[PDB]
Amino acid sequence: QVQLVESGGGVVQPGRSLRLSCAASRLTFRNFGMHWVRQTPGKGLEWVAVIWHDGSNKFYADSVEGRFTISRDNSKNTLYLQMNSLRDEDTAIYYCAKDWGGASDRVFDYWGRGTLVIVSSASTKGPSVFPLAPSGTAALGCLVKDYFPEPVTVSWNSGALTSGVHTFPAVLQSSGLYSLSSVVTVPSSSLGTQTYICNVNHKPSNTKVDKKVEPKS
Amino acid sequence: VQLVESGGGVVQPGRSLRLSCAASRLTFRNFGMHWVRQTPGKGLEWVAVIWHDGSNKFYADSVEGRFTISRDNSKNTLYLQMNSLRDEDTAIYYCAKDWGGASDRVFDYWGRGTLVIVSSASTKGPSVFPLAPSGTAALGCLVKDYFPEPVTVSWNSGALTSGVHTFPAVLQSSGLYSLSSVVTVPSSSLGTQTYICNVNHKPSNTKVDKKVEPKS
Amino acid sequence: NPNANPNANPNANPNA
Amino acid sequence: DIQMTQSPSTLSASVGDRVTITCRASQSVSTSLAWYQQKPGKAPNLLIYQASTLYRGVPSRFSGSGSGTEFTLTIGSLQPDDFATYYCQHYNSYSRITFGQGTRLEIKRTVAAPSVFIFPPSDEQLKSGTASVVCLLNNFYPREAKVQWKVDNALQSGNSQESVTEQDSKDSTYSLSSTLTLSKADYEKHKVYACEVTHQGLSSPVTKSFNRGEC
Amino acid sequence: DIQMTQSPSTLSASVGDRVTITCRASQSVSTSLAWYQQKPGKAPNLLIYQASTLYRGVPSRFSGSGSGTEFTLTIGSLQPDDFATYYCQHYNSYSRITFGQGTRLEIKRTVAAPSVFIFPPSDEQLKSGTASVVCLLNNFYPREAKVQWKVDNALQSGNSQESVTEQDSKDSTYSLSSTLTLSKADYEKHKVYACEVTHQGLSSPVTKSFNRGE
Numbered sequence: 001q002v003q004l005v006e007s008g009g010g011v012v013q014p015g016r017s018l019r020l021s022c023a024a025s026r027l028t029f030r031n032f033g034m035h036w037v038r039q040t041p042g043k044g045l046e047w048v049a050v051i052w053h054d055g056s057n058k059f060y061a062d063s064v065e066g067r068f069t070i071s072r073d074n075s076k077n078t079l080y081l082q083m084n085s086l087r088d089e090d091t092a093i094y095y096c097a098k099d100w101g102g103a104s105d106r107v108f109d110y111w112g113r114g115t116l117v118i119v120s121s122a123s124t125k126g127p128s129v130f131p132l133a134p135s136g137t138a139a140l141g142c143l144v145k146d147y148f149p150e151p152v153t154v155s156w157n158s159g160a161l162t163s164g165v166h167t168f169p170a171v172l173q174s175s176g177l178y179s180l181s182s183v184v185t186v187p188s189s190s191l192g193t194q195t196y197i198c199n200v201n202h203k204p205s206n207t208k209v210d211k212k213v214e215p216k217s
Numbered sequence: 218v219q220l221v222e223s224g225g226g227v228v229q230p231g232r233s234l235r236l237s238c239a240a241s242r243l244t245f246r247n248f249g250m251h252w253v254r255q256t257p258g259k260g261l262e263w264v265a266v267i268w269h270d271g272s273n274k275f276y277a278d279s280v281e282g283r284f285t286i287s288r289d290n291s292k293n294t295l296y297l298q299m300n301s302l303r304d305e306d307t308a309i310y311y312c313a314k315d316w317g318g319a320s321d322r323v324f325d326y327w328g329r330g331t332l333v334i335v336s337s338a339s340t341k342g343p344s345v346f347p348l349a350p351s352g353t354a355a356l357g358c359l360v361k362d363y364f365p366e367p368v369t370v371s372w373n374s375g376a377l378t379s380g381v382h383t384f385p386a387v388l389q390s391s392g393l394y395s396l397s398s399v400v401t402v403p404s405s406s407l408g409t410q411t412y413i414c415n416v417n418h419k420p421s422n423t424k425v426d427k428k429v430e431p432k433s
Numbered sequence: 434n435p436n437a438n439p440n441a442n443p444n445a446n447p448n449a
Numbered sequence: 450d451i452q453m454t455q456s457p458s459t460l461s462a463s464v465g466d467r468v469t470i471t472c473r474a475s476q477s478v479s480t481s482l483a484w485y486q487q488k489p490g491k492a493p494n495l496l497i498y499q500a501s502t503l504y505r506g507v508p509s510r511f512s513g514s515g516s517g518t519e520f521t522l523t524i525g526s527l528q529p530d531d532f533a534t535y536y537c538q539h540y541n542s543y544s545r546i547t548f549g550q551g552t553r554l555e556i557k558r559t560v561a562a563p564s565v566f567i568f569p570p571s572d573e574q575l576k577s578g579t580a581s582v583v584c585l586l587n588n589f590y591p592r593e594a595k596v597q598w599k600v601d602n603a604l605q606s607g608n609s610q611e612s613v614t615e616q617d618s619k620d621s622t623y624s625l626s627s628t629l630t631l632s633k634a635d636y637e638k639h640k641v642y643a644c645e646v647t648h649q650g651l652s653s654p655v656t657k658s659f660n661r662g663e664c
Numbered sequence: 665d666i667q668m669t670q671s672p673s674t675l676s677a678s679v680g681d682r683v684t685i686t687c688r689a690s691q692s693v694s695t696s697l698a699w700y701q702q703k704p705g706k707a708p709n710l711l712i713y714q715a716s717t718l719y720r721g722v723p724s725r726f727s728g729s730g731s732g733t734e735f736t737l738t739i740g741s742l743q744p745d746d747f748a749t750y751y752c753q754h755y756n757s758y759s760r761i762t763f764g765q766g767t768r769l770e771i772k773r774t775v776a777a778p779s780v781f782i783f784p785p786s787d788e789q790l791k792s793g794t795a796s797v798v799c800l801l802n803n804f805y806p807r808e809a810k811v812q813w814k815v816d817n818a819l820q821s822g823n824s825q826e827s828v829t830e831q832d833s834k835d836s837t838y839s840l841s842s843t844l845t846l847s848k849a850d851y852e853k854h855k856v857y858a859c860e861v862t863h864q865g866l867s868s869p870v871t872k873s874f875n876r877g878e
Contacts, residue, residue, distance in 0.1 A: 109278075
């Protein structure tokens with residue numbers, strides 16, 4: 001089966017460069033034009049660039065014209081994407097895509113797993129945890145604020161509490177830092193006898209924090 | 218000019234198979250060569266083409282990344298490496314010679330063909346069930362649950378041929394084939410003449426004689 | 434045309 | 450990829466007629482087009498290429514026509530040797546080769562209504578755990594017939610397969626088989642089994658019936 | 665470039681139903697249009713190209729039609745596998761490829777009212793000079809929910825953010841979380857902090873409220 005594997009993503013600062021690469025396997029690579037498509041955090045899709053089988057022609061989306069450069073090497077079955085002058089707006093998952101081969105149809109049949117590109121001026125910072133105290137069912141939870149970059153994983157009582165748990169998707173604040181909340185619905189009977197602790201993990205900052213959530217004084 | 222395909226047979230899904238086509242009485246290195254397959258629906262579909270020196274290879278959309286075409290001019294032979302076989306690959310596979318014209322991708326010479334069946338089923342002999350007649354009567358034999366094709370049915374060891382309709386086999390959800398064979402005879406002969414169908418499945422080495430007797 | 438056919442020609446002359 | 454569609458799918462003619470079949474493409478193929486003849490059990494044979502060039506050895510009664518998206522194959526006077534299936538094939542530049550689904554030329558004859566027979570599952574197959582009911586349509590023309598199974602006069606759908614013979618060569622008729630297969634559990638949970646055959650040669654659809662376990 | 669707008673953004677349906685989603689282009693594209701299916705954590709999958717042609721291996725229950733500026737994707741009868749997000753894409757000659765914003769196909773279920781909770785900022789977060797009030801809506805359906813913040817019975821705007829989960833696999837409900845973030849000095853210049861929830865499953869708008877200091 002045809003396989004595409006992208007590489008070279010990461011967290012980069014605005015205004016700097018980053019080269020993406022996509023390795024093809026089990027495919028007559030030199031026979032097909034190749035595209036790049038990206039997916040913004042809002043799940044919108046955006047075509048980036050196309051290159052012809054021999055590299056004789058290249059086209060770009062108006063948003064990346066002059067800053068991005070697509071190229072390929074048929075002897076190594078590798079597609080490239082040189083990105084320069086990167087902005088926050090370029091934050092996306094970048095797929096390399098194979099042109100279907102239909103002469104009339106610029107559709108993509110095979111996609112790679114994608115590679116993540118975060119454009120941020122923010123530095124790797126661990127999260128601050130604050131409790132949402134509860135006061136015949138009650139809702140309590142943890143506020144996980146101002147961390148970078150994604151993701152964090154939230155568990156409750158080291159995984160022994162799965163039911164009624166909701167870990168909301170992270171939201172990006174105006175400071176360039178991410179925040180989320182995780183909440184659990186529990187029996188109002190249980191608040192004075194059982195202890196509830198969230199277990200936030202932020203692997204980029206080597207962070208493993210716990211916080212006991214009890215009703216307010 | 219001569220083309221003969223080989224390497225066909227039964228292969229389980231996901232496995233691989235390598236076909237070969239031996240060209241004779243032809244300067245093989247001078248021509249591009251194709252593979253063309255034909256599904257049980259009788260639809261033709263181009264599979265691949267290789268240039269005269271392997272300089273280029275082009276593939277059908279449905280096999281790109283799983284089939285590999287190659288050639289050995291020193292042996293006058295065409296190869297086709299088939300990997301990750303699906304049920305949709307079950308077909309007759311012909312090697313075809315490109316005509317030689319610059320602007321016409323047409324096939325002037327073909328091989329006899331080779332059949333590739335993608336199936337998890339194992340070799341099974343058929344069960345032969347009678348179709349009992351109830352001025353012209355109808356009787357027959359239901360040949361069921363066998364793999365692979367084909368079987369051959371006679372009537373009265375071949376002495377009865379007029380009025381015989383042996384239907385093509387159909388593939389069942391079980392992955393086994395099954396067919397019918399019927400014959401129209403005079404109803405005056407039901408109590409007098411004996412009717413036996415002779416079923417043979419050479420992949421199973423099974424020979425079955427079934428007497429079809431009238432019903433009350 | 435940015436959406437013109439970017440792929441190779443599979444029906445080009447393959448013979449000697 | 451380019452879609453090749455052939456009109457009609459089957460064409461009835463008699464020896465000596467002038468026959469034309471057509472091939473329409475999804476987009477223009479210029480004149481990069483070929484025609485093949487194929488008979489059962491044999492590889493295809495080249496007839497026409499570049500839309501209208503006769504292949505050496507092909508009888509001159511064959512000729513191709515057309516440009517862009519619409520094409521024709523014409524047989525000036527149909528010989529008894531030309532009853533076969535005919536395929537078109539494009540090789541337009543920068544397009545992967547495609548074949549049409551084919552057109553079968555079949556021998557013309559008068560209408561012949563089918564003889565209908567039904568067969569309950571044998572006692573032997575009932576010792577097996579599966580029950581196959583078979584309806585036989587013998588020596589009919591034209592080939593288009595509709596068979597329907599009604600179990601307790603409930604219409605059945607999706608539990609039957611049919612099989613059609615090649616056109617007979619003595620009388621040019623067709624015969625058809627329809628096998629309805631059930632579990633033995635489902636076969637014994639119903640009483641009346643029938644096939645109802647609709648065909649051009651029948652005034653009304655004739656129905657053959659039987660009941661399970663009864664003479 | 666050409667703007668592709670899909671209608672609607674979220675379609676509610678049950679297995680067996682027939683669903684149609686619309687794609688509209690800001691200028692004509694003829695038939696140069698494709699439909700994709702995408703499931704969370706994966707790349708898109710091709711379904712239809714040239715407006716109406718089924719891609720190989722796609723089930724026959726997918727169909728497509730249209731030409732010019734309006735196109736529709738239709739699923740003859742839904743299967744569990746068909747719940748996902750669908751994008752239209754054009755490739756009109758001399759026009760750079762653009763995609764629709766996508767349509768989310770969710771499972772239909774009976775209406776469930778949200779359980780609304782409000783949480784004041786903890787004492788340790790205030791010590792950092794920032795206050796974030798949280799309004800929680802748990803296990804509701806359908807997805808449309810209006811959360812209006814009211815500080816001192818004055819409708820707020822532009823100082824909050826909402827986070828909603830995906831449709832839960834177990835009960836097909838949603839959960840929403842709105843975060844009102846204020847300055848510590850701005851937080852203690854006001855008394856009443858309430859969020860007002862408007863949902864189809866509530867006869868009234870419900871208001872959860874607290875008074876700073878209690």
